Design a protein around this ligand. Structure first.
Ligand SMILES: *[PH](O)(CCCCCC)OC
Ligand SMILES: *[PH](O)(CCCCCC)OC
Ligand SMILES: *[PH](O)(CCCCCC)OC
Ligand SMILES: *[PH](O)(CCCCCC)OC
Lengths: 401, 401, 402, 402, 107
């Protein structure tokens, strides 16, 4: 039983695996898994519960916090403006954010008496899109700089806005001279701020007009509307013993409020069908059902390794993206990119691109096989289980042409 | 006379060569040689005797000790379970064999007072499939560690079982920190033990159900059944003067008994037609006559060079696989892989994969030319003559398109 | 929507929107002429703003522009036509054809005219001339005592300057470095023009006319603007602080209107978008347009290769301003730049993209992977001022919808 | 417009114009025979000037030429025919077939016959012979005490010389270096010829005739010119100062007209453009011409690969004159040079272009990317004198018009 | 040296002008030896330390010492210092002065 060169009986191992290894033993609440090849959806399965407390099951239309899977959407948004001539990647950020002209590199000291050295060159927009800015994230919990992000709540918090992020970051140091290393950052939240600066629109309006309406994604937003809140999943966090506990109730969630923070880095709620339509648009070279969000050639450029000398993340990453899963994987303008299949120790193709969210949401596009996967669950953090590698083994196992 | 772009008159040089250089001068007892291209068998020749003492000739259906040619079959078996999500290659072995958690690297001393250092990282399943474990073989005869394997008879002997191997190896050191070198090992025997752990079946039953029955291989087994023992060849060993002497009588062979040792590394008896069906299945991307043993993509992954930085065996091998014949040849998940044709000093194609047995059995698959060869003889050891390189010269010489 | 040769014409309209919003309305450029072609079809052609601000005259399709250093690919084609006839080899020493140059030496120290020199490791070759690895320089570089000597002798141009004077003066000057060991943009292409003359027996304007302009149907390309075409000749502007510009060359009163006796293979030509399009399209086709062949397919493929050592980019070998970030991942062949690494260049495009530019902000490229090309004309010195040629690449590559 | 197989025949006429203007009229060469083929079709064939100046005899299509070192590809094919029959392996030691060579040692110091030696890291292999990494040399190298010993023993050729004498004398001489660690052009191909004899049971002239010349229809290729064909045999000339030449070998009373006992796999053959064309075309086709097969398609593909370590060019490994600029970006396989990097070579052509030359300025190449080939015949020693083979490449590649 | 008559870093060709254009051996047999330019001229310090690039006939290693032997520059019938200096002016050096050491007629 074969569609688009995929054995559907082999794809049934996905549901068998998620039941046996995660759902029955109580490691995940529930899952939504979609696989497509050559434009055809060949697998779509909801399993377990979206809300354990209320015994509500996962459905095709269940809404999920996709978190950092927001970043590819923000990256597409900014590259739409690149295609209109609005900026160049090698332009300094301080051309658009002049208060950032004299950013300096951390040397020593605690906030707010941090001493700094001059950088070799100013931060560029390419540095923002590739996380080579020298910016960081509060949750990194490694350096005095991310300690300053936490005391100023730059990851989010009451009264946080993009305007406050840009203003606070102007008076903070960088982990390193821009371009000389890689560190996962609020840089994509800054990219969102640049979409606003250049388009004249707030980020929710830019996304709606130039991405969600054209692709037919009616269930993707920064704020879950009151009338759709019944469909919104609960979020769970890891507990010792391979268990989980309630982390966010859908009723009385900050995702249900219009607080003033539009996070290009982690803000969006979506569903498997909406993210599938985004992913399929990219797999097609930027077009779905006569709507174009990006040029074929612009997207090809975003999918290239933009790290120096075709290095992988572990050759440049100062932190946790140094670890064995990211071996043979580079980074472009908002996507990871597989460079070396054997080195990654995971079956796949050179050029496989995608990203993930910290609640264990994942997607990839294999341009060699014209194959893609969207996986939705709500378990923080994504570092907990290697479910996204097991799914790659089963899905690549189902190719039979 | 040309079939599948091969001149059959040029292929007749095989039989002329094996007669002139080996059979008439009494260097080999007998040979069975098969060549196929694009799904079509273009050469099949039995020559000389399977049993010199009893004057019995080699026939198409003659049974041969294929030894280390068992390893690709064991590798396919374990990768079938990879495709079901049952493990990941970068997982530690001690996750499945917990007694192995505190394995350490040899420093100095004789068994049983060997001193050890901490390894930089624990052994992984990828390390087992690629012989980068730090495990070894008794017959290596190079180090105090392989001396301990010999005094404990871990290569085989009276009362030996997979359960005993895993138990003894838990109290022995490694030649080196896992991943940091290559050394041919009992690792594939351990892979067989993991097929058992994960499937719930003994290895002979897993092979029968998931490989031999589907491919139509009724003459491949760990134990030769009583009613087929008439077809079983004698095994010969090298003697000075380019001669040979009886090493194993087929009547009263340990291969005719069900002793308790199922060797994923060296145990199987087979015939040219059965191994042809396995080889042709691989050449086709894992399918023969509607039966699938492995996914096309999973097999493509096993055929890649899994050595660090695309190095050849001589750049990482601590032992005999360091020598000139293995120049320009890497190693994947149970197969050698040609990297550089000129450097190997042997005609062929980049990507040529296969392996050999210590009784001078050999097979290869050239994925560039869709060409393959199965060669059967019984002369220990395989290091004696370069017959497998002469056959490559003749076979590649017969391509006429 | 409206698609020609796999290009969305609505997406290509962003070119005109961009040049208006970013350059013309704010008064950074006087006027622009932009042409884009793919698979032999012109898919974009737009004049905007003024060719002469003082006289309120608009840019038209037929407006004539100082293309300057975009002369160099034409001179390079001319010399490679003679390579195809067996007249020289690239690894031959220049002094075989210019014997007075046999004892050229490398700058060590001193001011003109008491410059001390060292022996070069090897003599200058013709390949060194075509790739700017000669060790020659330009007066306008303003970096070294050697380019100071070029300026005091007016070797970039000036009253009574001829190719014969350049070759004679260069014989008594030192090189910035031992030939082949570095890259420095130079009068080398002016010397290439002198070699076209030596080998063909013709003056450069006659060689270009007979062997390139007549065959390709380029009637509006010349070293001297004829009296009867001077109405069509654009003014040249130079940058002023505040992202402004001032008159640099009045068309009526221009040295480009006189036959002053310097035929510059490096910077001399005046042309128009249609003439340079026909040259560019000929190259994109492998050296042929409408049955006329200016170069062999294979000879051109050879000119488009990276001729720098060890497949290095300009910043790994360039001693000067071509060291800077825009030329990262870009090499150099026989008269063209060549893109090596798209990500490294930080600009969308294809490996193999070739072309060059003029110091008045004229630019052209040919993408052989996409069979795409662009000719961009404006008159604003210097071209280092604005990154307009990168913005145009972003918009044009953005319009591909295959 | 004459176009055959994507080649402009008007552009190919530049060959004859060039050889007249640059070589024949000025008296640098006596005469030339030039053939060019593409996709199986001969597109150029021109005799020019004289085969014998003293007797005023012109060059004809059927003129016989000393092809010298262009013998080596034929000897290489002969030995690889036996590789295909399983008779040897490339990584086997030579001393397995020539046991007297087991204790060969590397030159340290001293003059013949009191040369001191060191142990080699490994014994010489057959791959070392086919790639000139043996450590053997040639008398005419005139660089080392070892080639001085070759000259005093006349191992390049001389009265009473035979292959049997070469193998016997070489057993008592040292190597320039430990086998595999460098490249030096050598008598190694003469030794390959000796191995064709050892393995086949036939003398080399009989092996060539039966297994190469008869099958391909090459009736005018031999070690000895038969009496009835001596009228067709060209004179050989050597360079004289002033770009002139002098008689080096009279065809009447030539050693090439005698059956002396020396069958040179390295330099012995006389042939003609048509015979060498048939050999070249057989190789361009993958080892087959008009139903006759001399070598397997795959075996030939293996001979055309770079067999130097780490994909190095000749200048990265060559101890001698093949270190110089013309061999930049060129490697070496089993009897052929192989182009690696077109730009680096400074000569138009394709990656994979293979061929070789003779010391009397005979040359051939096969471009497998363009399915193009050339055979060029003249008699002017030495081939290092003029760059005619690079000029011909420029004109021939210039004639591609698809 | 102590009387101020020369300095060690002075070129030899200051005192032996025929030696100004000495060149380094590349290839060939005497008397048709091809040569390359040296990086710097031979100095008196090079003579006193055997870093000249000169050699001795008896070395029996190179084509250059073969030329010394056929010209009997180590000694023999009619040999004088005047003949050594005259013959050495027309011979190549084993290497560019200063870049190696080779025991020689330098003394
Ligand atoms: P992403 O899911 C991080 C985005 C949101 C973090 C703010 C608390 O990382 C993979
Ligand atoms: P294989 O044939 C080794 C098989 C196990 C032998 C144990 C004595 O090695 C190439
Ligand atoms: P080109 O436009 C240099 C032309 C010569 C100018 C001499 C005054 O440089 C990019
Ligand atoms: P070949 O033509 C060398 C032939 C041997 C010459 C014997 C003196 O070298 C390119």
């Amino acid at each position: 039983n074969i569609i688009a060169g995929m054995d559907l009986n082999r794809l049934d191992r996905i549901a068998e695996h998620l039941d046996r290894a995660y759902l029955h033993p109580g490691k995940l609440a529930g899952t939504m898994t979609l696989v497509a090849r050559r434009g055809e959806v060949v697998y779509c399965q909801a399993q377990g519960l979206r809300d354990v407390e209320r015994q509500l099951p996962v459905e095709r239309d269940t809404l999920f916090r996709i978190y950092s899977m927001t970043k590819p959407i923000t990256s597409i948004a900014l590259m739409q403006l690149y295609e209109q001539g609005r900026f160049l990647l090698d332009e300094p950020v301080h051309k658009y954010i002049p208060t950032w002209k004299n950013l300096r590199v951390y040397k020593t000291g605690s906030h707010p008496q941090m001493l700094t050295t001059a950088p070799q060159r100013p931060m560029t927009i390419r540095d923002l899109l590739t996380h080579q800015s020298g910016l960081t994230y509060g949750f990194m919990n490694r350096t005095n700089v991310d300690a300053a992000y936490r005391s100023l709540k730059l990851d989010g918090g009451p009264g946080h806005t993009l305007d406050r992020l840009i203003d606070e970051l102007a008076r903070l140091p960088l982990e390193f001279s821009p371009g000389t290393a890689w560190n996962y950052s609020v840089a994509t939240d800054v990219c969102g701020y640049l979409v606003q600066l250049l388009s004249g629109m707030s980020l929710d309006d830019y996304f709606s007009k130039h991405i969600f309406q054209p692709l037919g994604m009616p269930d993707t937003f920064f704020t879950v509307p009151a009338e759709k809140l019944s469909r919104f999943a609960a979020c769970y966090e890891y507990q010792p013993g391979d268990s989980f506990s309630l982390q966010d109730d859908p009723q009385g969630s900050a995702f249900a409020k219009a607080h003033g923070y539009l996070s290009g880095g982690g803000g969006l709620v979506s569903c498997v069908d909406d993210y599938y339509r985004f992913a399929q648009a990219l797999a097609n070279g930027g077009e779905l059902d006569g709507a174009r969000i990006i040029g074929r050639k612009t997207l090809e450029f975003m999918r290239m390794n933009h790290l120096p000398d075709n290095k992988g993340l572990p050759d440049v990453a100062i932190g946790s993206f140094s670890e064995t899963p990211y071996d043979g994987t580079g980074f472009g303008l908002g996507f990871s990119v597989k460079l070396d299949v054997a080195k990654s120790q995971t079956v796949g193709s050179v050029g496989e691109y995608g990203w993930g969210g910290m609640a264990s949401t994942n997607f990839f596009i294999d341009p060699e096989e014209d194959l893609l996967m969207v996986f939705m669950t709500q378990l923080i953090p994504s570092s907990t289980y290697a479910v996204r590698q097991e799914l790659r083994a089963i899905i690549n196992g189902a190719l039979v042409d």
